[PDB]
Amino acid sequence: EFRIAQDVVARENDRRASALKEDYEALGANLARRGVDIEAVTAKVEKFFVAVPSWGVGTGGTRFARFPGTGEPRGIFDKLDDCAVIQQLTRATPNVSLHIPWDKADPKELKARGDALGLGFDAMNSNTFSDAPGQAHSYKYGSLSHTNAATRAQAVEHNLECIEIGKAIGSKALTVWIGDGSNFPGQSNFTRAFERYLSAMAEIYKGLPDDWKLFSEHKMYEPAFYSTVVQDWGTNYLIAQTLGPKAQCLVDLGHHAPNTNIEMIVARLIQFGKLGGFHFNDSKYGDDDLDAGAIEPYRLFLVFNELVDAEARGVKGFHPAHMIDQFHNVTDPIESLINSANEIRRAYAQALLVDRAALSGYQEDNDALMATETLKRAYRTDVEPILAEARRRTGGAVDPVATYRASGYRARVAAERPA
Amino acid sequence: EFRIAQDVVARENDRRASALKEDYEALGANLARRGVDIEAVTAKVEKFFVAVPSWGVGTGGTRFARFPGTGEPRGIFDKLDDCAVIQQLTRATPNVSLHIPWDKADPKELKARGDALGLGFDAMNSNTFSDAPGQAHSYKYGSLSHTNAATRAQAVEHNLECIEIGKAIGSKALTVWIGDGSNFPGQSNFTRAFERYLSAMAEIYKGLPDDWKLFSEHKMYEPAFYSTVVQDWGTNYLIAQTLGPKAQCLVDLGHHAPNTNIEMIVARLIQFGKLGGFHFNDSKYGDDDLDAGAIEPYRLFLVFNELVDAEARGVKGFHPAHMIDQFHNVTDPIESLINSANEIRRAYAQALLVDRAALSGYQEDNDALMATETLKRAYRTDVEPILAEARRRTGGAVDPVATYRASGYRARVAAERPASVAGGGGII
C-alpha cells in the first residue's frame, strides 16, 4: 500500500524532472573534473538509511505547552502510517524506532502493520523516566540507580519486557536513556548511584539476546538539574566497557555541554570500539531536539566526516546505528522528519566527496589552511541533485515536501482523525 | 487562623531556644568586635520580604514527567492555604504572586482568603504561552508578537483582564513573560516581531493604573529554541525605555546565557532606573528553577551586594519587587520554598554586613585582594542565628522545616485532598 498516491508522486517528479536533469548533469561534470564519479556517490546515498522516531511523528511539546496540529496520530498505528509517508517520499527511513510504553501494542500486530507498510524496526527504547498509571514504584527519585531495590528491579523488568517486544517485531537492540540524577548537591552519592546503575544494567545485559546490542545514552542534564548518572561520554565509555562486547555508547548530538567538540567524541568512541550509534537532531541552547542541520549544518557534516574517515582508515566491524531523535513543536512533524532525513543524507553525501588522499597529505605536512579548505571543498558542494536523483530512482520524490503538500495527506488524515 | 498549631511552633522553638541564645550571643560578640550592632541587622532582616509563587506550592515537572507528591493542592485556594504555612513559619513571604488563568477565581474570594490567612498579593502574571479551553486563537506561533492581529489583540485583552483581577485583590503590577520566538532561522523576522511586541505592550501599558508597574521578563531560550523576542536584558531595557516610566525590567536569575555576570546586569538596570524586580531561584545548566542558593550561594550574595549598595547610597525610591520563581520536582514544595526564602534573607543579611567604607577605599586604591576579602568577610559570616532569631521574634519558627515536619501538615492535607497521579509533562 502507498500512503501517497503513486500518480501524484509521478506527476510531481515529472514536473521537476527537467530541472533535475540539468542540475544533476551539471554536478556530474563538475565532480568528474574533480576526479569523482557522481554515480558512485548517488549509489551510496540511496543506501544510507536513518531510523525515524515514533515520537517524532506527532507534535511535541515543552514543559510549558504543547500545540497540536490537525490530524494528530492517535497512537502507534497512526504513527506507523505517517512514517510510511516519510519512507515512501525520502526512501531514507525504512525503519522505525519504538518507545515503550508510549508505543505499547500487540507486537504481532505492529509487525503485521510494519510489513504491510514496508517498514522495519530499529532499536527499542525503554522508558523509566516517567510513571505509568498503576505503577507500583515511582521513578521520581530514579530508576535503574534508585536507592530502593524493588524500584530498580521494576526498572530492569521493564527493560526486559522491551526486549521481548523487540524480539517479536524484528528489533535487534535496546537503547537505555534515563533521567536518573539529582537536583541538589548531596541528594545523591555520585559513586554509589553509579554503582547501582551498573549493577542494574548488568542484569539487563544478562537478559540481552546474543544477536542484540545494548546502547546507553549519556546526557549532561534534564530532567536532573544538578547531576546526572550517565552525564557524558566518559561515564558512557566506562559503562559500555564494564558491561561487555554487546554494550556500546549512543551519542545524541544535543546532549553535550556548550561548545563541546562532538565530532571528537565520535572519533574517540570509534577508536575504542564503543560507538553504538547516533541520535540525530540540531540545537542552539540545550537539548532542543530541532530538525537535523537546521542550526549548525557544518557540525553535522564534521560528524559524518569522522564516520567516513573511519572507513577510509580501514576500521572494520563498524556499522553504527543511525536514528533521528527529534520533537517537532511548530511544524508538520512529517515534513520536518522528511527534511531532517534529507539533511543527514546531505551531510553524508558531502563527507563522501572529501579528497582523503589530499587531506592526508595536508595533515601530514601541517598545512592547516589547505586541510580545512579540503574539507570545505566537499561541504560547499551542493549535493541536492544527488539526493533528489537517489530518491527519484528509488521510488521517492524529487521534492518530498512539495509532493507531500501536493498530495493533501495532512488534510486527509485530519478528516480521518479526531481533532 | 493558623495553618500550623501555635503550640507546635512554641514547642519547637523552646526545644532550640538554648542553642540559639548561645549562637546569637556569640555572633553578636563577633559582630561587635567588627563594629557591627547585631540588633540593627536583625531589625532589617525581620523586614525583608520576598513574594512566593502560587505555582511553587504544587509539585512541578519537566517536559519528560511530573511526579506529584501527597496532598497536592487542587486550586488557588489550596495553594493559598499552603503559602500561609510558609509565611507563618518564615515570616518572610507575606505576599503571593498569582498566575492567570491557573489561579483565576472570584477576586472577592481571593482577597477574602488572603485576608483571613494574613497574605497579600504581589504582581500579577499573565499567561499567553499556553492555550486554554475555548480559546479563539492559538499561541502556538506567538502571542503579543504573533503575526495575526486578532491573536495579538486577544493576548492584550488577556493581560488587561489580569490587571483587572489584580486591582480587585490589591496587586500593584503585572509581570509579562511570553515564550514568543522562533525555533528555526528565517521563521521570524527579528525586527518585525519585536515591533509587533512593542506595539502590543503599548496597548497593555495604556491600561495600567497610575500606581502600577509593568514588568517585562527576558529569557534567553525555552520554549523557543532558536530566537526569543525578549531574549536578554538589552532588549528588555529597550522595551522598558520605550514603553514608559511605569515599565521596568524583571530579572529571573536562571534566564541568562552560560557564565553571564548577572550581578552586573542588576547594577546597570539600577543605574538607569529600570530594575523592576527579581525572580529568585538557582541553576547550573539552563532555567533549572531550583531552590535559591542551593547551587551557587555566592552568586546570590553578590546580587544582594549590588542591591544593598544601592540602598546604602539612597537611590530613586528604589524598591524592586522581590519574588521567588521556582518549581520543585523532587522535594516537598513547602519545605523548599521555606528554605529558599531563608537563603534569600541569608544573602541579604550577609550583604548588610559588608563594610562599605572599607570596600570603597579598597576600590579607589585598586586593592583588588582586600576588596574581594572585604566582601568575603561578610559572606563567610554564618548569619543563621540572625535569621532564626528574626523568625522567633516575629512569630515564626527557629527551624522552619523542623517545625513544619513536627506539625504533620503534609500528612494532614494529604488526608483532606484527593490523591494525585504521575504522568508526563507535555513531551507528547
Added chain:
Amino acid sequence: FRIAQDVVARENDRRASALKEDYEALGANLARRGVDIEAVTAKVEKFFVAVPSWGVGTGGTRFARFPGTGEPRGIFDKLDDCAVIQQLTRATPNVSLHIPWDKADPKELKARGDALGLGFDAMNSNTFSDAPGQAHSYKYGSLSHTNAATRAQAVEHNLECIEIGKAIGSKALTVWIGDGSNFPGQSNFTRAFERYLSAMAEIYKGLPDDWKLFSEHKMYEPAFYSTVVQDWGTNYLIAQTLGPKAQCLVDLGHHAPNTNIEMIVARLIQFGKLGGFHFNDSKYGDDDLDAGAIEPYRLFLVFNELVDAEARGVKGFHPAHMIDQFHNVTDPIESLINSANEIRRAYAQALLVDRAALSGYQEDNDALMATETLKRAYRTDVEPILAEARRRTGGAVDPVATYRASGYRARVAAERPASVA
C-alpha cells in the same frame, strides 16, 4: 604590483575553462530560480571588508607565539602584505590601523597607502597595554580607571588616534579596552561605567563632523570576572548616551556561549546603533579564527540580517566591515585571503535569499518553508561568482594558489630579518 601580473594571468588562464563551466552552470540554475547571476556578481565585486594590520603578522596566545618566515618588520611591511591580499581578492581595499602598534608619520603612511592602492578604515586605540614613557599604567584600567589622571592620559591617546586618522583618510575611531575586574568587589560596577562614560564623552568632543565613534563590547578577556563594556546592552547604553556619532561595533567572538548574535545585530540596526562588524570565527571563546572556518551558517545568518536591513529600506545604514583575526598556525596572508573570501561568500548567499517568498512564509507562520528558503540560498555554491568577481577586477581566480605560485612568502622571508629579542 606585489604579485607579478604574468603570474596572476597564468594562474587565471589555467583555471578559466573550469570557471566558465561552473559559472555558466550556476548561472542557469539561478536563472531557473528567478535570479540574475550577473546582478549578484556586480554587487559581490563591490563588497569590501577592511583588513587588520595586526592580522598580517603571525599571532599568538598567552602561552606562546610561533612566527613564520618573513614576518613584517613594521607597518610599512604590513601595508605591503595587505596590498597582496587586495590585489588577489580585490575585497580588501582598506586597512585598519592600531595605535601605537602602527604609529608612524601620517604623511608617509598615506603615501604608502596611495602607492599600493590601499585606503584606511577606522582607527583603533590601545589603552589595554602600556607604552614606554607613560606617566600612568593601565594595569587597573584606562578610560574607566579610578585615577582621573590615568583617564585623561587615555583620552589624550584616543584624540591622538583621531588626529592620525584625519591625516590619512580615516573617518572613524574604534574603542576597545580591557577595563574590568578579576575579583568580586574589586570594582564598583556603576562607578566604573560612569567614569568610562565621562571619558568617552570627552573623546566624542574631538570627533570631526563626518566621523563615527565605535565602542566594542566583550564579555571577558583580559578581565575575568567583570568587564565594563561587557555586552551589547551596555554598548547600546553607551552609544545612546554619547550621541549621533556614537555607535556599537559587534565582534562575533565576543559573546557568551550560545548567544544569538544575529539578533543582537538586528536589534542594534532597529535602533540605529550598528556601527560595524569585526569578523572572525570561534568555537570556545574569542578564538579569533578565520571567518567561516568553524560555523559558516552563523556567518551567513549575520549577513541575512544585514541584507534584510536594506530589504526593509533602513535609511543611512552603512555599517563598517572589518576582519579582526589572529593567525597562529597559518600564513597570515593566506588566512586573510580565504577569510575575506568567506565573508563575500556569506554575503553572496544572503543576496540569493528569495525575500518575497520568505516574507510570505513568515506571515503564514510556515516555519519549515521559511527556514528552507534561507537554506536554498545558503546551500548554493557561490564560489564561481566569487571567482568571476575577482577575475573581472584584476584579482585571482584561486587567490591562495596564485599567492603560492608567486613565491611571495619566500621572497619577503629573504628581505625581512626575524626579530631576535
Added chain:
Amino acid sequence: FRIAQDVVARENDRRASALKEDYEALGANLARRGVDIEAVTAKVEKFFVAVPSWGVGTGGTRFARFPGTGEPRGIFDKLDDCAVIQQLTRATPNVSLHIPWDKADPKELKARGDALGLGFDAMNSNTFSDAPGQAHSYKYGSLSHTNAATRAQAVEHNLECIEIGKAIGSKALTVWIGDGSNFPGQSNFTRAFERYLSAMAEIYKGLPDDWKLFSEHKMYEPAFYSTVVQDWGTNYLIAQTLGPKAQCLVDLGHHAPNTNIEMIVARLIQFGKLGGFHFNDSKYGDDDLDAGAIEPYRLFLVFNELVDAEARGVKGFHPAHMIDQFHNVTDPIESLINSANEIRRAYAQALLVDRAALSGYQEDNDALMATETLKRAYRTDVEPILAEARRRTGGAVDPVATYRASGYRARVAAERPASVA
C-alpha cells in the same frame, strides 16, 4: 626566615584575643553538633597544597602583562618568595617546578629548597612553547606532532624533567601540552591521539618504580578547534592505556561551561585514576583566578567528594594537590596566601559534614535534608580553625596582614631591578 619572627609574633599577639573568642565560640557550636574542633584543627594543620613557582611572578594575558614591584626573576628569586607563603600559611611546604622556566643545577635547587624549608612536588614539562636553539618547533604539536623527530625531542625533554625531579626529591611528572588544531581537518583526531599515546608510552618507561605520570586534560587554549587531551574521558583512556603509574590530573578551570566537575572527580576516584588537582577559580574560561574567589561552594563540593572518598576507604586514592594560578592584578604572594587559605577552608568544611546523617537522607531520598546537611557544614565559618592551625604551626593568624606589616614586597623591590622605575 623570609619574614622576621618578631613581626610574626607581634602580629599574632595583636590578634590572639579575638581569635581565642572566635575559636572558643566555634568550639562550643561544634561541640553541640557532636564535633571536636581540636580534631578538625589537627587535620587542617596537615593539609598541604603545592605552590607553583610560576605563581609568585605577575601573570598576564595575550594582550598584556603588568608586572608589579620586586618581580622575582629566575627560580631562586621565586623560591625565596614561595618561602614567604609557606612560612605564613604553613600550608604550602612544597613547590611545583616548570622546565625549562626553572632550569638550574639540581644540586643548587635542592640546597636552596632545604635552606628555605621547601620541598618539591611534581615536575612540569613544557612542550607548548619553543626555547632558544630548539631543533624542532612545537608550533603544530609536540608529543602528537606528525614529525617523528619532533615527537622524539618532546619525549626526551620529558625524560629530562624526570631526571631533574629525581635529583631534587620529586616523585611525579605532570604533562600538559597545547597539542590540537585550530581548524577542522587540520588534524586527524584518531591518528593524533595514537601518536600521543605512543609518545607517552616512551615517557612512561623512564618512570621510577615510585613515580607517577599525570596527564592534564583541557577543553581548549592554545588550540581553538580541537585538543588531543580535551577532557577527562580522553584522559581516562590515556591513564588506563599507559598503566598503574599513569593517572589523571584535574585542573578546575579546564572544563566546558556548566560541567559538573565534582562528578568527574568522583568518577576518576572510583576507577583509581585521580592523580591530582590543579586548584584555581574561574567564571568564563581557564581564567586561573584565586581559588574560591569566584565559586567557593563548588570548591567545597570538590572537597566533599575527596573527604567522602577517604570516609569510604577507597583504594588507589591518594591525590596530589597543587595550586595552578596566575596573578595579573594583585600581589602574587598575597593571592597565593589567600588561595591556599581558601583550599584549607573548603577542606575544613568538608570535614564537618555529618556523613552518617547525609547517608541516611540519601538512602531515603530526602533531597532537601541531604543538601541542607552539606550546607550546615559549608555555612560554618571555619576561619578560626584556619587561623589557629597557622598560629600553632609557626604561621600567622592573618597571613596577608602580617605580610603587609613586614614590608616584604618593598624589601624585594629594593633588591630586584624592575624593567623601568
